[PDB]
Subunit: 361 residues, 5 copies
């Protein structure tokens, strides 16, 4: 039997197929079992709130008309061009942008018709999937990225989408994310879309994403610590040298302000407080408190010099000078100890909150 | 009756349909009732002055020729490919950019023909809708975003567009906007476009948008307050220490200037004064006034030292030194009280103006 | 008479039309009268030197073959799809980028054939029109934006383009430009393109654009004034306090430099001096002159202290100290008066130059 | 003779043309003479290393089959749609990106068939041409931008490309470049591409571009001069005032550093030294040398005060104080004279190197 | 024999070819030998992690049906339009974005059919190839960029891809990369993709890229050295002048911080430490240590003045003053020597690590 005649015969104008009609019309719904292979993952953007993926979508459904018995070979892979009339099931992604096809050299498609009528349809597509991301704890957090595959134009009674029994989501070996870690466990759950038109089958997969803390520690946490240490250095400088201590406190407060403003620039304009805001707030409060401490010392010395040059004035001079010296001596010890207590408290609470988020999943 | 023959018969070359002609030609106008479902809303940009939406446009019109009585089933959902010849009514969005269709896997369309000839047409489209936004009160404001659906090429006598009686605009459950709040109430009003060619039916929907004030309070209002408090701290420093007080006043004025310039960078170049401009102007006036106050104190002490080293000169020395000390003492109390009075006045007026805008709608 | 047969008959294969041929071939030129309606105007970019417009281009020409007498109704609006063969006259925009068509829901076109053979053709198109803009006076200027409609492939003897007698350019009511004001008067003038191939008809419309000065006054002119006032404040500070006065002069000069550099960033790299350059140059000269004035005062006091500690030396001490005090006293009065004279001179000259540009048009 | 029949006859299915075959097959090569008209030139980007042009490509070749004698009129301009089968010669640009066609209103093409069989083909295209640009002398330089027109799929024996005898490159009158000057003289030279497949004809045109020095003088050269003059001002300030002189030297060095870093931001990351680097290096060396000079003066005065307060100590005090005073006195004269000598040397050498580049062409 | 009839005959409807079927069906696999010519290479982006190339892909395979003996000429180059039915083998790039074709003037393709049935197919395509790049040593590193050519829809038994025996990868002469150096040696290795669908042939080429160190030395290494030298200059200034030394140390630490933050902005957010981080960390530690050294000197002098003004107090005054003077004297020598030792250690280790990376390849 010539191959050309057989392939033509399946699509044969003489034969009745009428691609527009679904298989087993006025009957039980067509069941489509689909599994995606994730070729590339990346380009996650917090500001735009979307991530880009490249996937091989594979759809398996049974068509009775396409059954053939003339050829013993059951595999019978076919040319992708003659995919015009194999009743491609309509599918679309509920949350998407873009979703272009790949036309390079030849269309990236794979049509394979089994002997019993099972059809394997494989298409390569890049998806700009948009997923909302909670930025409550910006430094360390776990983001769930969800892709929904939903039918358009065929109701649930008409068409049903089911996740593949084995290997529904497959990740390419060696695929890595620079800013994130992809969890191996995957959530395969189906939610049925309800509209005024009717109920349409939909299935969705959830990808847990864990943000690596290596960059943020170096970029943000270590510099702020340096600025706070510089403000601590200001205590050892002489109280008499007012421009040096004042300028040092001012410069550290200004540096903390510009660093805090600059860090959060590459982020969406969310209205809720973040972990990074708490850290920046406390560190900026520390440097501001150091400047206030010098202002208090200078004012006490001013009162000393006021009583000095216009009665127990000598006693008052010793008291006020001892008072200022005492504030400096207590301050140099007290400031790092309090900062250490805050640092361990903040890290412990955020680590257990991260553990709680991992507990919830 | 075979399904293929029936579907072919409706579109049947043997039968007369002639898609180019509208239903009930040389007769009463075709009435189209349309309701949109908003799948995704976001990407609002003040600078570009546009917002992006993804919608399921649904159009219902009655075609007498498409009436069928052979099949008892009235629903009879059909394949979207055979939408070439169902007389799709021309519609376009009056204010748009882009407006691409979704071609992923299969075209996102839904053709449903009822027994009486009613046609349900549902298409998914992303619209870069451009709406002018009044930025009189930039911090807190209510923006109305308007989408117009207007016929092109068919006059009002020829074709009429009407909003659906029930559920004209439907918002997807759980849809949220990071920077804005979407009001539940919606304005459905039709305005008829008039041109030299003729009058064309148009209908429009207004979406009230309320801008959340959570981010702007943290990002802009709280830092400016910190700079003003730093300028107040400058009073407690000794009058003799001229570089410290001068440098502190200069640094705060410079910081206020760069913060004010940086904040308004992500905004269109509108010529009218905004609320944020008033707040930045007053706070910068406060820090500038603090620097002028120190300049006055230093000049009074200079006149004291002028009379000191070259008659009532001793009396003049006590007067001038008391005068400078008095200006400092009055200033430390006076500056925060005046700032508090301005702050409550500004918040009260802007809150009642916001209430007035909500009153107008 | 059935409508379908009549519409088919006009385009009838049986009848001779041959769309490729122009009307009244080997005869007088086809005369096309065209008027544009400006739906949206905006997105003007100085750096890119282009502006984006959305227009309804309407072309009216007379075709004798399309005359019909069978139907009394003269209007007879038709479906836009059957525009393949109505001899669309070739038109293109001489200075353009992009120029995409709008394909949303259905093609945005309007074909209307009159009884005598007059054809009304209306298409909606967005044009990235590029117009050179003179930036001699950047702050306040009038820019003329020109759109040219020129034939391609048909010579002047073959085809002629004429502006509509009434309402050649129509602007949508309520259309506004945030950064510019659009003048009501319009220049309709035709210039004939000459090439080695031949002479091709072209027509052009000029849109005068006036740049609003509200933003630039607040953003650029008011801060520079603040920096100059700060430099004036430096005079009242004591001459003995060298770090305070020196640092203040340095900071103001640096601030003026960074403000001048930052302002002109969003501008093309033109080689000619602008009004904003003159203003920045003079204000920066003022702050630089203030720093030089303090350097002179400090040097005179230095010479006093040189003569003081190693003859009329006492006389020289009084002279030099009086000299420095005199320079400060004269300087505090002299600097704002001179700046006021410059300010009124600059505003008067630029206002009359703006008036002269309005005089020229 | 009816026009429709004649035009149809040339493309006539009855007649043999077979568009796929080239003219005079198995014979001498087809000779194509092509001239381009440059409608718009601009959008040159140093970083991306490309420039965008809009051109009217005109190709003239002789086809014997298209000869006609039935009509006396030799011009016989034709509709651009029937360009499917006039054997368009394959041409492509060797160094390109984009290269989109213009589809606005109607395709921008011009087919003109002469009586002898000469075919004139004119297409409008925008080309993102990428040309490497030597940035040895960044401030003033001459860049050559080259466009190559090369055949694809037809060997040199099969097809030959030749530049038009008269007017090969035509520039639109009044076309101007904001940042560059276009030289009138043009290089028309053909280079034959050699591949393993075979030899393919190619022709190329070189556009000399001269960069205007007006902007760079104002933006970069004048500010650096201001910073150097400010460092010179530092000498007149008293040696005793250590914070003023130190802060002034620091601020000028920092300002020079940020200006040098900021200027070269809009440039590719080339590894070779540029003229602007030499200028920034020398000016920054001048301000750094001024700060070192003050450090030397302060150290000499320190040694004076060391010998002062713990033998010829008095003699040493006069020597050291005279030494510091001498360094200041010599420095104020010496620094501008040396800078003037460098400035004239740099301008003379770069001007003669520019002249040498113009000499080479 | 007429050429048209012969070309038509090969594609002849009368003859059996059936393009959908592969050559020698139900037989040994089709063997495709492919070599790419790299026309342009560049646009490497670290942040996006992709590079753009323009290539001439050439595929050679043998088709028995296309054998011809009627014409003696074996070359017989053909028109690219009749490439619809020459059984183009499906190929796609495993890691790609974009991959557009070039449609300018005519499609850029070359079909050449040999006498024995060998088919040469050459297409020009621009590929946005994405390759992960290890940034362990950011300053100097060697990056391997890999392009994979893999079959889609034909299994390994069905179709095999092989690299050309001679000249598999050809680079255009004179092609250069501004920021990188391309190694002449190339890795041609084939890896077979394994999927659940089956095994598909793939071949890949590796391009070693060496990053030039010329720019980074000037832009980053030389400024940091300048800041460290400025901090060394701070030692020569008098210990009594507390504002000058304090301000100088603060300014250098701040400058180092902003330079370090600014440099790494154009880089991906990787979590691992880089060479540039080590260099910035050490240099910033040096400037911070200089500021701590002045704080220690000032504190020792403070203790001297504490013992001075409220027993061996005189002895303590000489000891403490000598101690501070000793710290300054030792510090001025010690700091550059230690920095020199670090500099040679860092350069030696990174150079041998670069040599080790070149050793591994
Ligand atoms: C320690 C902080 C105080 C403020 C110190 O600051 C100073 C001086 C001494 C102070 C005590 C300044 C500080 C650096 C240190 C010098 C320390 C370096 C040798 C490095 O650091 C160590 C510590 C670091 O552990 C957080 C540790 O990371 C590991 C974590 C993980 O393995 C467990 C793993 O992921 C990976 C292997 O790496 C690692 C051993 O490297 C240096 C690499 C840190 C980067 C330095 C700079 C990079 O750009 C940063 C910032 O953009 C710039 C603005 C300021 C720099 C700075 O902030 O400078 C900066 O941060 O000295
Ligand atoms: C007056 C200048 C000196 C330097 C004064 O500076 C300071 C203190 C006092 C000095 C004398 C600083 C200056 C502001 C003033 C405070 C003045 C405010 C109340 C406002 O101003 C007035 C004057 C203004 O008339 C030019 C006038 O505009 C009209 C013009 C038109 O109607 C005729 C019309 O279009 C429209 C209605 O508005 C208007 C009544 O509002 C305030 C709104 C000005 C904006 C303030 C700031 C906005 O961001 C600017 C800049 O990005 C930032 C960097 C510095 C600010 C500043 O520069 O601060 C800034 O400019 O105090
Ligand atoms: C002269 C330099 C020293 C440093 C002077 O600096 C200061 C004070 C006095 C010092 C001696 C500062 C300096 C400006 C001058 C004031 C001079 C202005 C009146 C103008 O200048 C003159 C000189 C200029 O000739 C180079 C000359 O150009 C011609 C060249 C060509 O015709 C032969 C032709 O192409 C075209 C016609 O224009 C022209 C007559 O205009 C002013 C227009 C210069 C621009 C001023 C500023 C623009 O933004 C610049 C920079 O972004 C900012 C950061 C600092 C400013 C500055 O740097 O300020 C800045 O440059 O005063």
């Amino acid at each position: 039997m010539p191959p050309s005649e057989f392939l033509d015969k399946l699509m044969g104008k003489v034969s009745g197929y009428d691609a527009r009609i679904r298989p087993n019309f006025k009957g039980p719904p067509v069941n489509v079992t689909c599994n995606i292979f994730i070729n590339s993952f990346g380009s996650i953007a917090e500001t735009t709130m979307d991530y880009r993926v490249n996937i091989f979508l594979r759809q398996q459904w049974n068509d009775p008309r396409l059954a053939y018995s003339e050829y013993p070979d059951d595999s019978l892979d076919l040319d992708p061009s003659m995919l015009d009339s194999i009743w491609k099931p309509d599918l679309f992604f509920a949350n998407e942008k873009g979703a272009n096809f790949h036309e390079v050299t030849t269309d990236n498609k794979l049509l394979r018709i089994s002997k019993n009528g099972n059809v394997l349809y494989s298409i390569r597509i890049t998806l700009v999937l948009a997923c909302p991301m909670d930025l409550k704890n910006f430094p360390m957090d776990v983001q769930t990225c969800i892709m929904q595959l939903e039918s358009f134009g065929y109701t649930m009674n008409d068409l049903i989408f089911e996740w593949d029994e084995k290997g529904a989501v497959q990740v390419a070996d060696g695929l890595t994310l620079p800013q994130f870690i992809l969890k191996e466990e995957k959530d395969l759950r189906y939610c049925t879309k309800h509209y005024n038109t009717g109920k349409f089958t939909c299935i969705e997969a959830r990808f847990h994403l864990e943000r690596q803390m290596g960059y943020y520690l170096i970029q943000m946490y270590i510099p702020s610590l340096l600025i706070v240490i510089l403000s601590w250095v200001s205590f050892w400088i002489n109280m008499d040298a007012a421009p040096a201590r004042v300028g040092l406190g001012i410069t550290t407060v200004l540096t903390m302000t510009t660093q805090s403003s600059g860090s959060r620039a590459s982020l969406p304009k969310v209205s809720y407080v973040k972990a990074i805001d708490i850290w920046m707030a406390v560190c900026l409060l520390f440097v501001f408190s150091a400047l206030l401490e010098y202002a208090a010392v200078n004012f006490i010395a001013r009162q000393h010099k006021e009583l000095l040059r216009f009665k127990t004035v000598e006693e008052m001079r010793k008291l006020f000078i001892s008072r200022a010296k005492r504030i400096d001596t207590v301050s140099r010890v007290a400031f790092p100890l309090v900062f250490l207590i805050f640092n361990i408290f903040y890290w412990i609470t955020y680590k257990i909150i991260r553990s709680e988020d991992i507990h919830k999943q």
